[PDB]
């Protein structure tokens, strides 16, 4: 049994150690759904990393506009391919377009992939849509038969290969079945947003990831699914897995969490904010109704905003934005705003697939971290939790329990 | 890398800096969406701004029709062609039809842009219905190839340019393009809402979704960005809170007892400044309390994002201080009560930046003791909120923006 | 831009003047939603009032039975046709069917269209099934290229024209494309039971209805959407947008409507009944156990009943029913039986559409009305509703507020 | 402009008039559905009470198996044949097949019919599947122009026919026709419910929708129109109310606690005047209270518009005083209990007209204090309403219809 590294920002461990090798892997997704962009990373991560050499093969487009598409993440291609980088095989459409007199068999693009191999040392190459090359050439028997020719070729030569294909979920193996492991790239739209998923039925004769799982993209396309106060009279009422305030509509925690961090900058400690609601003007003249100084608790160096409306952006892409936030900053304690606005128009196994995310990433990596939100939690979620808080009736947050044990059982009595 | 701007409202900031350049960009809608629209429009925006000239191709519609399309927005086109500036193609199929005898060298159309293109020298080009010549030409075959060296032409020339095509399905043999703009119309219920989806720019910073839009004189399309307190005064008690300028208010309550309408003194102050469900009927009501309405003046029936864009220019058109939105309730519904409407959310945004007062009002489901808030539930981003109702009974609820009284 | 009113009951002000002129207009719908009926209604509006003479062409029908169709909503066609009213151009088919000997270009039939307008003066010519000619020649090509150049034709001339053409929702464009303005008549079914409704997706260069609204027929097609006590303790409780009757079962309320209205015959403004229930024999000993008399109350020119059970009639044909009998009789005030009824079998939207209309339209012809209903609103509907109201329990009416003040607040203390 | 009457039990009326006259109407179902028994019956109602003669055209259907057919209903027609009035036309696919050389001129057909109506005087014809000849003949071009001449022809005529073709879809290649009927058979859950839509009669008067309907001896089919209370007695306390023989009563209790049978002695009062849940077991169960059964006489497994029917006419049979109906609970269920079943008030609506008296059976849910009064919820129609059931609990509801003492 074989296999083959691919580094992608969190795919290789669902394959559990990549692609395998001297075998041909198919990908097919839907139009728009990054499957050459899976191509080009794939191979830009073997030159880079493994320094091996790549052939890039395009039917539906051309060079000079796959390099400009390349170069949007911030890769230099051409100029770095004068090293003897990876090889891009020309095999756009003349314009004029083609005439026939006869039948083909495509031997000059498969012997022309070979000889490119065998000068450039490749030991990977990926191949952009072969049904354009259906729709290329309007004779849907040889081609069949000729792609067969090359995959199979190319499990002879052993090298690493790819090739990206063309109503997602539903009948989906396009018209090119003649594979031997595959991935297919979904991007579902339900409601009015869009989730960009990648699911592994099987690769054939390997280890493999049990289903599918979401993805978004960056430089180069990312996803990592599986893992495994101060202030206040603060611990008199306590005596991490990050604090919870869960609370009815003006859940004022916006308090508990200002000073939650603003204790933090007194101590030295690093602290960021993430806030998904106010104007973070009348964030802090709600919390500068406390008297606190965040734009002076602030001389850079110590704390970023830059709010987010949650609706705005994706679920994940959010995630995303704070994980290389704090991955850029290294926080020691940060606090999330409302909760609530993500417990709501969104099905809410997306929502606590995020919140088991977030929590199980600030967790252990040993930050501490506050969550608020409000309710009408009624998201019923229990679990991992820890800690949660004559006529008229003030407001009055209290514990159960946090850690073991110790804290204040009964409220304020 | 680069990129076009279109300066049509509001589509510019979600392709995040507008339609891709040297590049052909497909457009696709069912039948009856406004794709030619967004074309004309397009071509219309980059002369008028940029002076930069520009060609409509047109099979479908006919050239002194859509002129006389144009018209509706207020625009002359036939000025703008005898300027010099843009010139609209007639592609359309001669009426009298066509005989065919063999294969086709599509290479007339094409040299005739190319032409018209290096002539104008046009920067911009829009190509309205390539399918009709799939209603005309019943061989798929060589259109490939022709629009295929088209677009590759075009991109030679470099030239920005579009293509239409004709409900959530793909693309009816239009063959794959390199950036990829789907608007569809939705029909739900028994209304119909009509949103852009931009399914890729390949290459490019890009925004997520679909994204609902409604017409004016061009289109128009929802994006998502972003004496202490003047107000009423109300006698006997006088704001326990005021209502901060920047503020709105929530008086949320079991059923439309706030006929008092607090929103009285709201536009009191206002008009003391002096600054600016039948409201006739209401308006004989409203001179029940002994206010001066003779003297002050010196729903299914729109979409959702009507409402809003109609305000949106009335706000724009009159400079309020501090206005209020009449039993938003009768907005949640009519729409059936699981349909959550962000658009709350939209608006409360737009107040938060041109100093703008608003006040809201709601009417809630049951009565006593409900733990349950808000019917299909307005929580926070809402600043002032208040409750409603023996006798009826007002109360406050929850804040810390400020601090006071907790009401009974 | 252009526009030419129609005068269809309520049809013009969603297409806010009228048909496009100079443009071919296509009407689409599935088989049995009144296509032809919209032609013949449009066109007879158009002689009868803007005396704009009409063409009717028509491929499935016979003239005969064309007449005889449009004589049941009361119009008599062929003795005014000699007038010079409308023309039908008959292209019926010949029975006997036609044999071929080669292609054909339906010159023979546009060319009579332009002398039959040209010869009647004609600005409005309809056209009914043209699908009929896809299915009456069984070449699918040309038919295509000749109604095309039959509507470019139209638009030359400047005429104002209809089509008419044959799954309501899906799909829906049938397979003649080739129009500049479409309007699609589906009447959809749910449940167990049929709404008509128009939709207009959009008129080209020029305004349209933002959307889909339901009719129903009379004496031409109607829809009208887009808006915009005395005796008893009586007023001692209380110190017009109608008045609601919420209650459990057995809400009694038939005495606090019967007597609203009977005192109302007394005082001499004008009142009428409007019961969906009871057989109304149990109406009036339900209300001739209170003592009062109504088939005594009524010497004719005064009040009129015949009532009607909700299920066997749609919610909407009942809201044209008491439109003109509100209409026919012009009542001061007047009260309605089991809102309850019509609460349920239907989707809430139905219903509310329903109440609305009901509400917005006696809210404003300043008539008073009174309403009914039975609980388990549960409907939970708010707004505009107005007034509304030792062992044993009895029943105890008392109200919340009217108006904008007084009452008593308090219920029987 | 007119219209015939076609005297089928209950679709006279949904037509509002019967079928049209001098047009051809299509009658079309999914094949199983009882399009053909539409059809003969059709023809034997005219010829049976009109004494207008009948013209059948069966090409599915063999002639004598159409008479074995019939004697199902107990009605002789090759007695009718011989009488000179109904024929029944046999075009019947001869079983041998066919072979084909061309084209053809389907004429032989069409002058069949009009000789033999013009021999019969024919005023009534039905055509049973124009499909089979699809099913015949591959030719689906030519079948057209012959079906068009044919209903033309007959309309020259102008006698009433019927075309009969074979869920909810369309009408599978049988063309528009100027009137038509679609018989639809529904399947639900586990069961099948056979229902009539009509889609249109152009140019006339028509009811609106798909009404449900059964077979008997002809078809059945369910439209919509519309001591000074004798009744029980029941000791200790005798009637507060009585519950007016034109009333019904309504007793709604948790579980069938109701076993006591208040209608023992509303059955009394019947015998009194003399006037007429294993029920055998019940009627042993019955015996333990002292009343005199043995002396007395001197629900899945049926559809509900079945039980409907069936009771119809066990009401038609034996003019009862008074009856009740057992356990509606369970009537209600067996079905899901979100799928609303008008039925209740159709017979309420009998009750009304012809004097007869009902009782109504049924088991609420819980138990104490429940705002919700009945289930699926039955409202106002019924007259007498009561409630039932620390100890058991009767209690009045409320009525005005009367007034009396409010129950415990
Ligand atoms: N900066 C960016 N941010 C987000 N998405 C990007 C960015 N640059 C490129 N993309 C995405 O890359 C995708 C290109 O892949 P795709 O559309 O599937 O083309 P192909 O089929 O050739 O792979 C586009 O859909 C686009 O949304
Ligand atoms: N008063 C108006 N209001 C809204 N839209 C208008 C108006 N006048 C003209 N238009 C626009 O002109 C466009 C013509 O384009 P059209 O061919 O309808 O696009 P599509 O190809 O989607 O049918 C219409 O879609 C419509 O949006
Ligand atoms: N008095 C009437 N009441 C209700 N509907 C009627 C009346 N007279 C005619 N109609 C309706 O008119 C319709 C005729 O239009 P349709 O069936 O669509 O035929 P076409 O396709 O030729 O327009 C019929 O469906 C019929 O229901
Ligand atoms: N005892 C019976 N009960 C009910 N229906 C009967 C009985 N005997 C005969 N029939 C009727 O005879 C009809 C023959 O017509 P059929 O060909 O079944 O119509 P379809 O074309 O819908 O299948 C049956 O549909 C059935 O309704």
Same mark, same amino acid.
């Given at each position: 049994?074989? #296999? =083959? ?5 969190? $795919? ?10 001297? @075998? ?28 091996? +050499? ?8 051309? +060079?000079? !506009? ?29 314009? !004029? ?12 693009? =498969? ?5 490119? =191999? ?9 191949? !952009? ?84 799982? +979401? ?5 180069? =396309? ?9 202030? #206040? ?26 000073? $939650? ?32 100084? $965040? ?32 991955? !850029?900053? #290294? ?71 946090? @850690?073991?044990?110790?804290?204040? #059982?009964?409220?304020?009595?």
């Amino acid at each position: 049994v074989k #296999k =083959i590294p691919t580094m992608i920002e969190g $795919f290789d461990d669902i394959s559990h150690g990549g692609l395998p090798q001297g @075998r041909t892997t198919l990908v097919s997704g839907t139009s728009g759904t990054g499957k050459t962009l899976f191509a080009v990373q794939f191979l830009y991560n073997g030159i880079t990393i493994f320094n091996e +050499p790549g052939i890039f093969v395009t039917f539906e487009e051309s +060079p000079q !506009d796959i390099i400009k598409n390349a170069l949007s993440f911030g890769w230099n291609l051409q100029s770095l391919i004068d090293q003897g980088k990876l090889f891009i095989l020309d095999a756009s459409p003349d314009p !004029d377009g083609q005439e026939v007199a006869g039948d083909f068999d495509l031997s000059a693009l =498969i012997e022309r992939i070979q000889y490119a =191999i065998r000068k450039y040392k490749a030991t990977r190459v990926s191949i !952009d849509s072969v049904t354009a090359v259906f729709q290329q050439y309007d004779a849907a028997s040889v081609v069949r038969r000729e792609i067969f020719r090359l995959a199979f070729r190319l499990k002879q030569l052993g090298v690493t290969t790819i090739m990206t294909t063309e109503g997602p979920v539903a009948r989906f193996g396009v018209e090119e079945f003649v594979s031997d492991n595959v991935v297919i790239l979904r991007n579902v739209l339900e409601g009015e947003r869009r989730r960009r998923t990648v699911e592994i039925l099987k690769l054939r004769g390997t280890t493999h990831m049990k289903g599918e799982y +979401p993805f978004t993209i960056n430089n180069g =396309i990312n996803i990592f699914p599986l893992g495994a106060s101060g202030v #206040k009279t603060l611990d008199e009422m306590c005596g991490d897995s990050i604090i919870l305030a869960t609370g009815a509509t003006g859940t004022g925690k916006t308090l508990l969490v200002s000073k $939650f961090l603003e204790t933090g900058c007194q101590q030295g400690e690093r602290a960021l904010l993430f806030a998904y609601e106010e104007s973070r003007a009348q964030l802090s003249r709600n919390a500068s109704s406390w008297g606190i100084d $965040f734009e002076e608790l602030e001389r850079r160096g110590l704390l970023r905003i830059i709010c987010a409306y949650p609706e705005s952006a994706g679920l994940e892409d959010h995630l995303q934005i704070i994980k290389s936030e704090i991955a !850029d900053f #290294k926080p020691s304690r940060v606090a999330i705003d409302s909760l609530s606005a993500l417990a709501r128009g969104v099905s809410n196994n997306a929502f606590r697939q995020f919140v088991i995310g977030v929590t199980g990433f600030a967790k252990q990596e040993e930050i501490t971290g506050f969550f608020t939100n409000t309710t009408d939690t009624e998201s019923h979620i229990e679990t991992i939790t820890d800690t949660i808080l004559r006529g008229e009736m003030s407001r009055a947050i209290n514990v159960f329990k946090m @850690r073991g044990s110790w804290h204040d #059982k009964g409220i304020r009595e």
